[PDB]
Every structure is written in structure tokens, then in C-alpha cells.
Amino acid sequence: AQNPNCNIMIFHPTKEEFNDFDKYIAYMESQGAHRAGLAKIIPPKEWKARETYDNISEILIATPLQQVASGRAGVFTQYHKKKKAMTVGEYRHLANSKKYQTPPHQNFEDLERKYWKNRIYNSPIYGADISGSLFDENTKQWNLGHLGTIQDLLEKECGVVIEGVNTPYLYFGMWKTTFAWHTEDMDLYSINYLHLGEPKTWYVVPPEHGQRLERLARELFPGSSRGCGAFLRHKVALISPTVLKENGIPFNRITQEAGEFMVTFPYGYHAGFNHGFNCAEAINFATPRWIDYGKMASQCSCGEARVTFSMDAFVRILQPERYDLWKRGQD
Numbered sequence: 001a002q003n004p005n006c007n008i009m010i011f012h013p014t015k016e017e018f019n020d021f022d023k024y025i026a027y028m029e030s031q032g033a034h035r036a037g038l039a040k041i042i043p044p045k046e047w048k049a050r051e052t053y054d055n056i057s058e059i060l061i062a063t064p065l066q067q068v069a070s071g072r073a074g075v076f077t078q079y080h081k082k083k084k085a086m087t088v089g090e091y092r093h094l095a096n097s098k099k100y101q102t103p104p105h106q107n108f109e110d111l112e113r114k115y116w117k118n119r120i121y122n123s124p125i126y127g128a129d130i131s132g133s134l135f136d137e138n139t140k141q142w143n144l145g146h147l148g149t150i151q152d153l154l155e156k157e158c159g160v161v162i163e164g165v166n167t168p169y170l171y172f173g174m175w176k177t178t179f180a181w182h183t184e185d186m187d188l189y190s191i192n193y194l195h196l197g198e199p200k201t202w203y204v205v206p207p208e209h210g211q212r213l214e215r216l217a218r219e220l221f222p223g224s225s226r227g228c229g230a231f232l233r234h235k236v237a238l239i240s241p242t243v244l245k246e247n248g249i250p251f252n253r254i255t256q257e258a259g260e261f262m263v264t265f266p267y268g269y270h271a272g273f274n275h276g277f278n279c280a281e282a283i284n285f286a287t288p289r290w291i292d293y294g295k296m297a298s299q300c301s302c303g304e305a306r307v308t309f310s311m312d313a314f315v316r317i318l319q320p321e322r323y324d325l326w327k328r329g330q331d
């Protein structure tokens with residue numbers, strides 16, 4: 001079995017190997033990359049997502065989210081308070097202000113220490129889930145706006161034609177902005193490209209050990225667990241690496257820098273934070289190997305998780321028994 005310790009693998013495709021997205025994902029899995037839950041892909045040196053970022057300040061963040069924490073430093077939840085719209089130019093200025101800017105630090109490890117020590121005492125503002133793309137239309141390789149759609153993959157594998165579309169989303173982050181422990185909707189893959197700015201640190205649990213993380217989460221967030229049998233779908237709970245180590249949960253960590261892709265694999269729980277002002281783009285995708293994960297994916301039916309139009313069909317076709325109850329949650 002390849003990669004039996006479930007380490008995060010890093011890949012350096014040639015420009016030739018960068019032509020066929022599906023084939024390269026299948027290559028990575030042949031080397032065991034999926035066992036980690038997360039892989040890094042460094043694009044060939046000849047490749048670029050677009051010519052410059054010089055003209056992005058007029059993008060609108062219509063609903064910036066202030067991420068308010070509750071709990072203790074290593075075990076907390078966050079809630080998203082909606083703020084007034086601002087442009088990316090305004091947001092970048094805010095990120096760079098004395099109140100919100102990255103503190104002086106020695107290196108990534110020192111910054112990670114400061115994050116876990118101090119995150120809960122601040123409320124950084126996150127521009128999340130903004131439909132759109134920063135890939136130039138002329139970028140032909142690994143253009144997250146030109147991937148084959150999950151609906152087409154389901155059709156190719158299973159023969160069923162369904163409604164729905166699949167488009168990318170932009171994330172504008174600042175110091176301490178945080179992504180809570182989650183898997184993707186319907187335990188899909190995700191791909192994330194860090195277009196610009198400061199790094200993003202990731203933590204990941206191997207898919208084969210995901211239930212260990214869930215069990216811990218039920219112990220650490222006991223009221224949330226009683227309210228919903230899939231409450232990590234709410235995307236609000238954080239557990240530090242120290243806490244994960246104290247409870248024996250297998251995980252890995254890696255820092256993504258500007259110009260790098262990360263791929264999350266089905267049922268790979270991940271969480272992380274941004275080091276300073278940055279802009280990422282991400283999208284879900286599927287492969288044939290995903291189908292069985294989609295069939296087994298947990299679902300939130302308490303009504304909190306409230307997700308896209310396109311997830312309807314996935315639940316309807318892959319999880320017909322659940323469909324009824326899940327849709328009660330979504331209405």
C-alpha cells in the first residue's frame with residue numbers, strides 16, 4: 001500500500017504532466033496521496049494563473065464575515081457576524097491596519113504558536129465564498145473555472161443526468177482568519193489555489209481516521225453533538241494541534257504559499273488559518289473514486305448547514321433514503 005503513514009505529499013508536475021488534470025489526480029492517488037487527506041501541487045515554473053493581480057481591488061466582498069470565537073484557546077467555536085460590504089481594496093487596507101495585521105514573528109512555527117495562543121481574543125474579518133474566478137480565460141492548465149463538472153462526472157459514471165452547476169469561489173483572508181474542521185459537501189474533493197499574498201496553514205486528518213476526529217468532536221462539543229448528528233457540517237468548530245495530540249488523533253499540517261495548489265480528498269477533514277492578507281480560489285470536484293464516498297456522506301438535517309442548489313441532486317440520486325429528511329432541513 002502506498003503512503004501507509006498517510007503523510008501529506010508534495011508534487012512537482014512538469015508542464016507536460018500539467019495538461020491533463022484528471023490523469024494527474026489519478027497519478028497522485030497511485031502514489032498514495034489521498035491517504036493523507038491533503039496534497040500540495042507546485043505548478044511548473046512556466047505556468048501562470050494570470051498575468052498580474054494589479055487590477056483586483058474593485059472586486060466586492062458583499063458580506064464580509066467577522067469571525068467571533070467562544071471557548072478556550074485550543075477548543076472553540078466561531079460564529080460569523082455579517083458586516084457591511086467593502087471592496088477588496090478596502091479589505092486589504094483593513095487587513096494591513098494596526099488592529100488586524102500580522103504580528104512580528106520569527107518564522108511560520110512562531111506564527112502558528114501565536115495563532116493558537118491568541119486567536120480567540122480577536123475577531124478577524126473573512127471575505128468568503130464569493131462566486132467568481134481570478135484565472136485568465138487563456139490559462140488552459142489547472143484553471144479552476146474550466147474543470148469538468150461534478151454533474152458530468154455523475155453522468156459519466158452512473159448514467160443519470162441531473163440539474164446543477166459547479167463554479168469556483170474566492171476567499172479573501174487576513175491574519176487569524178480561520179476555516180473550521182470540515183469535510184466537503186457530499187465528501188467531495190476540493191482544490192484550492194492561493195493566488196496572492198500571505199500563506200495559509202492547513203491541518204488534515206487522514207480519511208481512514210475521520211471517525212476518530214468525529215468522536216473527539218462529539219466529546220468536546222457535547223451540546224452541538226446532541227443538536228445534530230453531523231454538526232461538523234456547520235463549519236464552526238476548532239480543535240488545536242495540541243488538543244488533537246493529547247487525544248491521540250492522527251493528523252498532519254502544511255503551509256501553502258502563494259502560487260501553490262492544495263487538493264483535499266474525499267472525507268479528509270481539514271481546518272486552518274491565514275497568515276495575513278491573501279486571496280484564494282477553490283472549487284469542489286469529483287472523480288470515479290468519489291462516488292462511494294458521496295453515497296456514505298453524513299448529512300446535517302437540523303437545518304443549520306444550509307447548502308447549495310446543486311447538492312440537492314447529489315442527495316436525491318446518491319442518498320434517496322435520506323432525501324426527504326435532508327430536504328426538510330433545507331426548507
Ligand SMILES: O=C(O)CNC(=O)C(=O)O
Nearest residue numbers: 171179190191192280282
Ligand atoms: O481557504 C479556505 O478558507 C477554505 N478552503 C477550503 O476548505 C478548501 O479549499 O477546501
Ligand SMILES: [Mg+2]
Nearest residue numbers: 055056058059
Ligand atoms: Mg477590480
Ligand code: NI
Nearest residue numbers: 183184190264
Ligand atoms: Ni474545505
Ligand SMILES: [Zn+2]
Nearest residue numbers: 228300302304
Ligand atoms: Zn446540523
